[PDB]
Design a protein around this nucleic acid. Sequence first.
DNA 1: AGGTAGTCACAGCTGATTGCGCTG
Lengths: 258, 380, 322, 38, 115, 179
Amino acid sequence: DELNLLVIVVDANPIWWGKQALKESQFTLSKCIDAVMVLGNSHLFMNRSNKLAVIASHIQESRFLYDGKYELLTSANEVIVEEIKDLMTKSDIKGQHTETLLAGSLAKALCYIHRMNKEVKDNQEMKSRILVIKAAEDSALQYMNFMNVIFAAQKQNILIDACVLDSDSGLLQQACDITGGLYLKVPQMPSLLQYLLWVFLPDQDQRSQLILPPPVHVDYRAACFCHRNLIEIGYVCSVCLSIFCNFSPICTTCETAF
Amino acid sequence: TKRWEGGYERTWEILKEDESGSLKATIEDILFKAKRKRVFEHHGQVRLGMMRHLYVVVDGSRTMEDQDLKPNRLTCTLKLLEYFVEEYFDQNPISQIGIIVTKSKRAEKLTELSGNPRKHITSLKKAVDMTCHGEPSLYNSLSIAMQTLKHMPGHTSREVLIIFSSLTTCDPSNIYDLIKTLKAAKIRVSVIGLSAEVRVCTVLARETGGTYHVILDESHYKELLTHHVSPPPASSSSECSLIRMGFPQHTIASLSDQDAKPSFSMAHLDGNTEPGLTLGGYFCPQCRAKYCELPVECKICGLTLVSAPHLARSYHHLFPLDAFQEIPLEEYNGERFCYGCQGELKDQHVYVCAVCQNVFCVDCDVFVHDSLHCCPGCIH
Amino acid sequence: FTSDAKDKPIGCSVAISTYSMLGHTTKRSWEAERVMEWLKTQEWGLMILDEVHTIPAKMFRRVLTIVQAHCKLGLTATLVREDDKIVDLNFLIGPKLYEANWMELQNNGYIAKVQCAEVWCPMSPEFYREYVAIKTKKRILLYTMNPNKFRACQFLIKFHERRNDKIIVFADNVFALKEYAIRLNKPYIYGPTSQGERMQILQNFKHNPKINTIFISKVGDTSFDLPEANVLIQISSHGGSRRQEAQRLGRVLRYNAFFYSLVSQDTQEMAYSTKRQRFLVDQGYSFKVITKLAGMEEEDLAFSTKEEQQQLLQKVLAATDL
Amino acid sequence: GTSSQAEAARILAASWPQNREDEEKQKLASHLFPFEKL
Amino acid sequence: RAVIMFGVPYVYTQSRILKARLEYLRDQFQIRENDFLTFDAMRHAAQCVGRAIRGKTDYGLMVFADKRFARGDKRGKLPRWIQEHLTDANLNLTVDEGVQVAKYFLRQMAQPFHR
Amino acid sequence: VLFQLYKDLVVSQVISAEEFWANRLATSQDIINSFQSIRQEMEAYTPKLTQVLSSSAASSTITALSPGGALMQGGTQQAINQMVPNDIQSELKHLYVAVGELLRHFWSCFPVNTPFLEEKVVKMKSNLERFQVTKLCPFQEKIRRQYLSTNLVSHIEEMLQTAYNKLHTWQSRRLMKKT
DNA sequence: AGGTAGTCACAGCTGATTGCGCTG
Ligand SMILES: [Zn+2]
Ligand SMILES: [Zn+2]
Ligand SMILES: [Zn+2]
Ligand SMILES: [Zn+2]
Ligand SMILES: [Zn+2]
């Protein structure tokens, strides 16, 4: 009766993968997608009751991605490949927006988990976790929405795991620490599949038995309301708790309340 | 006339048939009506607050040995005080709690006014095994509280909570003058009695703007403390009320890097045993002092070290999500897939956001308004 | 109008009296005779009858016919009764108007969710031989005074006193109750004690932390002003009275509370307990069977050794009411 | 007596419903009463 | 909040003034001497104990520290607005139970009420 | 402890007796070109089986994830509870207390709004330097003699450097304000 | 071989007797 749900969020930012292809490195977006598909196939292999969802995080929007091989796995992989092809080929850069919409993808993942939980029969409990692989740099403009998503995930007891590839993200560290998930930075990109199978494949009950890397140094720098940048020391209002980098005689947020 | 002396109600007349079997449609309507039982707000009360400098005064007289509350008044009072401190610090991020114990016609400042919950809980646990003797002195406790809170900034709400078990208090001077001074100092005094109503407590609560209540049982005591947890309403804008506080990132040290520098914790330095010389923790952004617990004000430079998620957890109150426009399924000439869960829309009502004009089902609408507090479409 | 104060019942708007006084078959008091003469000479609106279950009696049925009233309202909590005379109440007063749903009533939180328990205690070998040897009504005291049931009752009393729970211990067969209450040194109501002693005991039972457990012998089998209680432990009740069990349960509701029934295995009390709970299971209550009490040997209980247990046979066989 | 206590405890604690329930245990909270949860 | 009567207040039978009135009422109005003395005692007790209730919101505790008050011939002389509040439960209770009753009453009388 | 602190600051000429009790009382269109190139490259995409993982990569990952690896470091302050004996740990705690008190005085003096505080901050910096020379340098020499692997002095050095940098920045601001 | 009126236990009520208290 143990139903495990694994929603995998893939950072599909075209600019970062294009730069990676320009670097002519051994790791590309195709290999990352293959590793994600193999991890999902393994998750479905572990038990009948396991459910899988793959969400691709893109600049324009968030896309729900999902011969000797398993029949259900074959259809799932074909659907994932078709969806990722449709997303990438029709992805036209129209605007100066470059930061990935990670917060929206996590919100959609939470909504999908909420939908799945109701459809789960009352005799079974659907344990849900969200795995995020990070490719591009962190986005500071989405601080409030990301924190709201973290709090929503914590309220429903949903694990959030981050698998950072190149550049660390403070928001992902905070999400992993608050929701109880694991934060891991991959040293060798081609070993992404092995890292996922070794670390993020087991469930939280299985994570208790297995010895896993200790949590990384999570930062808690706040975002200034008028600058939206990381700060160490800032002015915080006493009424609305809004954070400001510099002293002001009249709080901007308190202006709303007359 | 009387409501029940007229005609007997027939509640079963609601259901009707036209095609012999529309009861399925009626029960579908009933099931749809069962949902949306909330007002799309978890609290629905005070959406804001203010910095509170609350002082808790605990009676330490012989009356605390009474067994009205098992096992005695002191133990139940201290347990409920630990619960109150935990809940108050949970619902108030930058608040401070002070504890004063009055005994033998004198008042002892058990704990300094600060924002550390662990210190207050430890002090209460230590005070569990105190000696209950003498008579309480409301005058001395109020004098200590007023002396401490007179220099506090005006924008903070200064509050005193008094747990008065004994019905008699010894005052070295006139107490009504002290009440007038407290009223002039805008210090709110609230009293929770245990035995019966005392006139001085009622006068003090009425004049200082607080509330005076008398305990019926332990459940009523907990209810009164929980009511005292809630912050008071805050005025629109008084002055330039701000505060210099830091956000110490939890930088732990790893020996894999060459910058793994062990350091003793300032909070643990005052302990009798060996202080925790852990690899890392919370380093002060101003003077690089090391602390383990948060929120703890820095001992060296005086900077207030707070946790950003704690402050951000209340941000959804400032910007609540507007209710989506309820639209029947037939009248919506657009996509029939929910934007949040990708599920097929088969319910009679479809909710559309006012900003992005997206499609949300009933379950996703409830989840967004109750828990997410943000529209997924508006984020993009 | 109960021949105690005589608060001038003549010329009154609302008159409150009791049964067994309006249907006297013997000579009546002069003041009472005049009051009855006045009361039988005018119409009554809404003659309220309390404890309507005991209406179909030899002398209580004539009470309805001895006075004239327009509306007859019957109020009760336990409408069950033996001798199948409840059907007679359909024409004696009227049809069953309202029957409260106890499960949904306790779901709303306005009725205490009582956790019913049916815990049995094995018969000691020294007692079971005498139980099976005698059959002429002398076996009632044998399974009532079971040492194992005594230990179970003492353990329950001590456990619920350690957590400050008000306990009402119902016990018929007052002969057993005498040695049951003095052994624990706790207050008990023999029943014909006085009027004042019972009132003061029930008054100091509630607003006193030192004493929180009392013993009742068939006196609390009606509607009284007993204070709020959480624990009920009944031992040796009547034969198959579903009414008595329902009334005793009603003294607890007002898992907020829980009530226990102690029976002796391989005795008639087993069948009595089985047949007296069919009203409560119809009301929706489930009686969990408790076979072992946790920490029975953890602390010291009475009748620890076999010497006093076998000595108890001498005193329990000493009735000899022949 | 020392042996009387043990004999009485053995007889009382395990008379009918223990010589078989314990055998099953050897071979193999909401609804639990407060004294059964301590 | 509490009015305590230490014993039944009986007027001094000496000075040969009260006894003359007792004899006059005995031989003129057929008034029993014991009845008149009890009436005077209970009248004074009720007069001095009923001054703690002035106003609807006002409340007070009334005790009678004498077993002689428990007898019916003296309780019946109390005003009717006190008789119904004097339940038969507390007529001879000891000091400890009287204190417990006072505690319960005072605790339950401190809660807010309506108009 | 206070008497020991008094001796270490007054007898050793770190601070004067008067001062002791005074305080106590992105790119160009090349990015679009890269986006077009990656779009064209991923337009013709097929799943792979052999290239997903290799024996060498899996072995390296297991070595990293095995105890004692980069991510699963096993040392990580093995016996610091017993390393650098508590006699030195007591001295380190005393040094921490002294540094904390001196920096508390410094940060209480800051910000400098009156000319009187300017001399006080200079005297505080001189006291900090004297305390460092008196205690930390022999402490560092003792640590080097014992060859302790822990960088205990590093935190004190960081705090002193932060205080000195703050004071230097404030002095630079003060000089510029007078220009 | 089967079934109903006495009968016992335990409680209630009301109707009288009958036995102790009844002034500073
Ligand atoms: Zn700013
Ligand atoms: Zn503000
Ligand atoms: Zn600091
Ligand atoms: Zn939806
Ligand atoms: Zn929207």
